[PDB]
Amino acid sequence: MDGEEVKEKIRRYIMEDLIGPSAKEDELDDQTPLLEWGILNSMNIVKLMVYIRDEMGVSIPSTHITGKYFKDLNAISRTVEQLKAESALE
Numbered sequence: 592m593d594g595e596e597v598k599e600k601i602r603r604y605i606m607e608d609l610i611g612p613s614a615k616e617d618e619l620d621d622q623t624p625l626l627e628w629g630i631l632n633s634m635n636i637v638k639l640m641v642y643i644r645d646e647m648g649v650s651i652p653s654t655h656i657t658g659k660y661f662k663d664l665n666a667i668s669r670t671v672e673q674l675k676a677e678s679a680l681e
């Protein structure tokens with residue numbers, strides 16, 4: 592539950608849903624910019640919100656919905672791990 596072993600699973604879900612059954616595994620990477628390559632555009636982007644809400648118990652707010660936080664997996668990494676740090680009351 593370290594975040595990192597979860598973040599790689601996000602990529603698996605990205606290809607299966609966010610791309611679909613025509614998942615171009617070749618181009619799949621963490622440093623591959625999803626927003627920039629039109630992999631994520633609104634209709635599918637809500638899946639990132641609800642996924643992480645179900646997974647790491649944290650949903651990215653509508654104020655943090657921006658292409659600069661959603662650029663790639665590592666962009667989402669910095670956003671999702673910071674939010675778990677800000678949500679950490681412990």
Ligand SMILES: *P(=O)(O)OCC(C)(C)[C@@H](O)C(=O)NCCC(=O)NCCNC(=O)c1ccc[nH]1
Pocket residue numbers: 632633634635636637656657658659661
């Ligand atoms: P869909 O996932 O519903 O995106 C809705 C969107 C964020 C475009 C809408 O609520 C909105 O606020 N539109 C006005 C422009 C805006 O706020 N842009 C911010 C950057 N946009 C995005 O990061 C983004 C994500 C998804 C679509 N645009």
